[PDB]
Paper text:
SARS-CoV-2 variants could induce immune escape by mutations on the receptor-binding domain (RBD) and N-terminal domain (NTD). 501Y.V2 is associated with multiple S mutations, which could be divided into two main subsets, one is clustered in NTD (L18F, D80A, D215G, 242–244Δ, and R246I), and the other is clustered in RBD (K417N, E484K, and N501Y). Combined with the antibodies that we previously identified from convalescents, a total of 831 anti-Spike antibodies were identified from enriched antigen-specific memory B cell clonotypes, and 86 potent SARS-CoV-2 NAbs were selected to test their neutralization ability against circulating mutants, including 501Y.V2. Among 86 potent NAbs identified by high-throughput single-cell VDJ sequencing of peripheral blood mononuclear cells from vaccinees and convalescents, near half anti-RBD NAbs showed major neutralization reductions against the K417N/E484K/N501Y mutation combination, with E484K being the dominant cause.
For example, the VH3-53/VH3-66 recurrent NAbs can display two types of binding to RBD: the majority of them contain short CDRH3s and can only bind to RBDs that adopt the “up” conformation, whereas a subset of them feature longer CDRH3s and can interact with both “up” and “down” RBDs. BD-623 has a long CDRH3 and belongs to the class 2 VH3-53/VH3-66 NAbs. In the structure of RBD/BD-623, Lys417 and Asn501 do not contact BD-623. The main chain carbonyl group of Glu484 forms a hydrogen bond with Tyr58 in CDRH2. As this interaction is mediated by the main chain group, the E484K substitution only has a limited impact on the neutralizing power of BD-623. Due to difference in their binding epitopes, these NAbs exhibit different degrees of sensitivity to 501Y.V2.
Numbering used by the authors:
A (entry chain B): 4 to 212
B (entry chain R): 333 to 516, 522 to 526
C (entry chain A): 2 to 138, 145 to 225
The structure:
């Protein structure tokens, strides 16, 4: 099921979080449920049968369905609602299907662009017939970035590993991206670049052998 | 000139499951209900039309002996006017019932170490049985609003449940064998 | 009240593992149950369910390889896994699935009681210590240590034996296709100090008894 990756709201505001399935999923049944999940913790049920709340769930949380799309609405948005939210639906024949998840941010400080440091391969790593590019990404808010690498001008997908964002002690976020490289590849190109896009604006750093 | 073969139903070796209760027609014989009454120490033997000694005076066109196994705490449901899974989904008496209900504990015969699962009862049904109706169908019961497509699954149940008669069961969960005598002239006292 | 899971661990591709979900305050044999799994950094995925009469259902990504079952004598649910693949690596939750008889009004169809979760890692990697590489470097210089290709987690990083903590950002690790982890630590120091003060990162990887010190120089 298809959910937005991210949703933002200021304290006291109202948000909505959509969940789109098919005529086979959300469309055919009134069995949509929603779950709240906090880092390191198990999911918690907050809505089932599209609209009903478990005992103990605040009526700031409400649910609806229209066509193939269910929605979760949170009013009076509090800091404690910053979490991941998952929809779920009966999928026919005693099976169940979850949405991909939506990360809800409760804005508690102004938006901040990522700070980017790019390190080229060290001498010792090259002397071991290996090479790694290290792109460290700091101080961004909210915690969603995408990372793209370029050898000279052409995009690179192979050899790229990027971490999930992680919350810093100041409640901004950090991330890492690594490009695994051949010594020849590193020496051969004139430069490499790691491009970090945050809120549709991109920060780039570039290194050269 | 000869007796009714009540031992053919009472002392039978195997008993039916309650959801598929046996009926045996009894006819063309002489029946002494006072020797049946004192034939054993039944935990239950309760008549609703008239009494045993009274019955040795009457004649009937036919007598029927229904027999089956249930658990102890359901023996109270084999009575006119009762409700519960047994009285409503398995074996139902007419409100205007003229006959006797006879039951005795069957723990030694019908339970087994690790459980006897041969005895079944109907747990789900879309409506109550009629008095003396027998339903042995085995459709998947649709408990909710989504289809079952003929298999067990979400809110879709096989309708029969087994007792698990173990010798160590509490007395309300031990097997009991039941005979119900119906009196609708071939059978006399 | 509670569902207490156990049995997770590390296993090689093509291996087998049995998860258990011990219940307390609910009866497993009287409930629809499910297993739901969550890969690191990913979403929930429904895996399996058991209903009445022993009926069981499975996700396509799991048919023929996993089997859900229960022991009533232990009030415990199980997930038996075989032919494990690397993409089966996940936290595995067990949950109770409410049904029509929960309130006898509606159909239910949601997971209201959840286990703690238990971690399952399917990898052929071996315990392996990291290679440590210095990342040599306005008013401030950023300098670093690359802690490359170790298994398993975790690794400890400090600077100048623990005396340098101001301006230190150690980043969570990444996982590579090889199955090995890497992470980095960077320290922002005044660039006026780069000729006078020394910078050493200290890396401790206990699973491999590996302790490394690396001087980070311009």
């Amino acid at each position: 099921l298809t959910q937005p990756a991210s949703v933002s709201g200021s304290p006291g505001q109202s948000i909505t979080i959509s969940c789109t399935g098919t005529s086979s999923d959300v469309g055919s049944y009134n069995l949509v449920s929603w779950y709240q999940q906090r880092p390191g913790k198990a999911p918690k049920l907050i809505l089932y049968e599209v609209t009903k709340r478990p005992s103990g769930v605040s009526n700031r949380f409400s649910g609806s369905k229209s066509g193939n799309t269910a929605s979760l609405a949170i009013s009076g948005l509090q800091a404690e609602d910053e979490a991941d939210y998952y929809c779920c639906s009966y999928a026919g024949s005693s099976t169940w299907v979850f949405g991909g998840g939506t990360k809800l941010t409760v804005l508690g400080q102004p938006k901040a662009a990522p700070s980017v440091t790019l390190f080229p391969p060290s001498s010792e790593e090259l002397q071991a017939n290996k090479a790694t590019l290290v792109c460290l990404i700091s101080d961004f808010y909210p915690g969603a970035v995408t990372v793209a690498w370029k050898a000279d001008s052409s995009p690179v997908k192979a050899g790229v590993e990027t971490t999930t964002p992680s919350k810093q002690s100041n409640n901004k976020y950090a991330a890492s991206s690594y490009l695994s490289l051949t010594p020849e590849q590193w020496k051969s190109h004139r430069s490499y670049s790691c491009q970090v896009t945050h809120e549709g604006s991109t920060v780039e750093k570039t290194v050269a052998p | 000139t000869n007796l009714c073969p009540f031992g053919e139903v009472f002392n039978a070796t195997r008993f039916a499951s309650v959801y598929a209760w046996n009926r045996k027609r009894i006819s063309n014989c002489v029946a002494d209900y006072s020797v049946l009454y004192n034939s054993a120490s039944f935990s239950t033997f309760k008549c609703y039309g008239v009494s045993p000694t009274k019955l040795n005076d009457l004649c009937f066109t036919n007598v029927y002996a229904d027999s089956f196994v249930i658990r102890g705490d359901e023996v109270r449901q084999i009575a006119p006017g009762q409700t519960g899974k047994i009285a409503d989904y398995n074996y139902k008496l007419p409100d205007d019932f003229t006959g006797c209900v006879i039951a005795w504990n069957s723990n030694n015969l019908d339970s087994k170490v690790g459980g006897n699962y041969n005895y079944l009862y109907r747990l789900f049904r879309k409506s109550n049985l009629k008095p003396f109706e027998r339903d042995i169908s085995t459709e998947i019961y649709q408990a909710g609003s989504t289809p079952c497509n003929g298999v067990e699954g979400f809110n879709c149940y096989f309708p029969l449940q087994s007792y698990g008669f173990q010798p160590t069961n509490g007395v309300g969960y031990q097997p009991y064998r039941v005979v119900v005598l119906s009196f609708e002239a071939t059978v006399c006292g | 009240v509670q569902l207490v899971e156990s049995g997770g661990g590390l296993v090689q591709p093509g291996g087998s593992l049995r998860l258990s979900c011990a219940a307390s305050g609910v009866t497993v044999s009287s409930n629809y149950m499910s297993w739901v799994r969550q890969a690191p950094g990913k979403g929930l995925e429904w895996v399996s369910a058991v209903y009445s009469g022993g009926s069981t259902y499975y996700a396509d990504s799991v048919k023929g390889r996993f089997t859900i079952s229960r022991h009533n004598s232990k009030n415990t649910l199980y997930l038996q896994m075989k032919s494990l693949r690397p993409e089966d690596t996940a936290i595995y939750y067990c949950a109770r699935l409410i049904n029509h008889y929960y309130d006898s009004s509606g159909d239910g169809g949601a997971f209201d009681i959840w286990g703690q979760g238990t971690m399952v890692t399917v990898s052929s990697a071996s315990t392996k210590g990291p290679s440590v590489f210095p990342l040599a470097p306005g008013g401030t210089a950023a300098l670093g240590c690359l802690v490359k290709d170790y298994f398993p987690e975790p690794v400890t990083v400090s600077w100048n034996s623990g005396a340098l903590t101001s301006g230190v950002h150690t980043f969570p690790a990444v996982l590579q296709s090889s199955g090995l982890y890497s992470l980095s630590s960077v320290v922002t120091v005044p660039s006026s100090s780069l000729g006078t003060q020394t910078y050493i990162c200290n890396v401790n990887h206990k699973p491999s008894n590996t302790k490394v010190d690396k001087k980070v120089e311009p």
